[PDB]
Write a protein that binds this ligand. Structure first.
Ligand code: NA
Length: 423
């Protein structure tokens, strides 16, 4: 079907996605966590920052991407035609300690989605040190792939400020309006075979965390080992995502009260309704449950997970949001939460995202998701697999997440080197 553009309605309100609605209500106390926002925060270091150049690039991106000018208003989303140019606030800091105090303030700020802008961008000059760029974007409006697109454009524009990009020919607003946007029956069919989320040890009731604060652990698998592990995956009839999911679930099983459990998978692939759809910013998130049922050998367990994954992917028009409701109705409980999440940006041609030699050098970051305890996020860059776990640190016993991360990194590396554990 041909894409239907409605430029005369470009600035009219439009409906929020299911994911966006969940984020907004996740600002309030819920079944699995206190209220929290949904933003993504990164600190970059820039040698010899040219503020005027950065401001030009950023304002071009605001003009280029409708969803940077979006707000939530009267229960819907809306793109603002004209917004005041962003004049970047700059702080003068005399020590790295002073800059850390600013980072801490900005990384945990609350973006009000009702008042433009639903982002923040400030800089900090530190005497005799690289300047800092503190960037805050909201997953309420820009999904993970959108944030990779936008950050790559920000790097590219700052490096090559003379290049002008032609306007985008398709909008997120119009995408959501397309017609294309028994799967429900297929999901209802196996409500009895979806086990609860991982029953991980907690140091308190998660509902009793009034102001959840996220922390991050990050790692990488070097490009030689990641190539080798992808090859071994192929030889064992597993996608790379299935291998990573199975390695992670092995660690989670070892800590959980029950060895079988369900994860919520966050995916970003877009329906191919316009040839340039992968170039725009918006919320294209899909959520999909996937259960881990360990068997005799890791390999058998991974192969069962891959088969389940392949089938489930065929039914993502029914969201995990809906399935969790069906699960709670079937089980006669108020809610069935899925607070342990796996988020994959593999496969989206964002090669060399955050490439080592980037002028905007990422040095620190954190992300929040309401009603989530632990989010394992992955992406590929410069041939390496890069990953981070974002988690509510206060929920878990001291040292627990750090130890699980240590075990996960060790197992990942060993399985990339050592053929033994592939049965
Ligand atoms: Na977020």
């Amino acid at each position: 079907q041909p894409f239907v553009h409605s430029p005369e309605d470009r600035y009219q309100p439009f409906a929020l996605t299911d994911v966006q609605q969940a984020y907004l209500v996740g600002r309030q106390p819920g079944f699995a966590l206190g209220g929290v926002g949904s933003h993504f925060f990164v600190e970059f270091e820039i040698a010899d920052l040219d503020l005027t150049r950065l401001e030009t690039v950023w304002n071009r991106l605001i003009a280029r991407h409708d969803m940077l000018r979006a707000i939530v208003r009267d229960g819907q989303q809306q793109v603002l035609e004209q917004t005041p140019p962003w004049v970047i606030p700059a702080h003068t800091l005399h020590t790295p300690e002073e800059a850390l105090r600013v980072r801490e303030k900005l990384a945990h700020q609350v973006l009000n989605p009702e008042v433009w802008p639903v982002f923040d961008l400030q800089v900090g000059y530190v005497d005799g040190m690289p300047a800092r760029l503190w960037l805050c974007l909201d997953n309420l409006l820009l999904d993970g792939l959108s944030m990779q697109i936008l950050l790559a454009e920000l790097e590219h524009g700052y490096r090559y400020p003379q290049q002008l990009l032609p306007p985008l020919p398709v909008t997120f607003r119009d995408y959501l309006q397309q017609p294309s946007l028994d799967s429900l029956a297929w999901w209802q069919a196996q409500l009895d075979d979806i086990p609860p989320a991982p029953a991980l040890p907690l140091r308190c009731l998660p509902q009793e965390v009034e102001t959840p604060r996220f922390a991050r652990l990050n790692g990488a698998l070097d490009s030689t080992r990641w190539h080798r592990l992808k090859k071994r995956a192929a030889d064992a009839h597993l996608t790379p995502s299935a291998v990573l999911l199975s390695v992670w679930s092995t660690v989670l099983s070892a800590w959980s009260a029950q060895p079988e459990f369900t994860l919520n998978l966050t995916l970003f692939d877009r329906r191919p309704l316009h040839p340039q759809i992968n170039q725009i910013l918006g919320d294209f998130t899909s959520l999909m449950l996937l259960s881990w049922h360990p068997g005799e050998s890791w390999l058998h367990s991974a192969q069962s997970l891959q088969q389940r994954l392949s089938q489930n992917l065929n039914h993502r028009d029914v969201s995990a949001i809906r399935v969790m409701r069906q699960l709670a109705q079937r089980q006669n409980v108020p809610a069935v939460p899925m607070p342990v999440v796996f988020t994959s940006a593999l496969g989206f041609e964002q090669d060399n995202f955050l490439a080592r030699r980037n002028l905007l050098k990422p040095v620190w970051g954190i992300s929040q998701t309401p009603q989530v305890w632990l989010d394992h996020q992955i992406y590929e860059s410069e041939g390496e697999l890069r990953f981070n776990w974002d988690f509510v640190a206060a929920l878990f016993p001291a040292g627990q997440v750090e130890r699980q991360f240590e075990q996960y990194c060790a197992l990942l590396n060993r399985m990339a080197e050592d053929e033994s554990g592939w049965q």
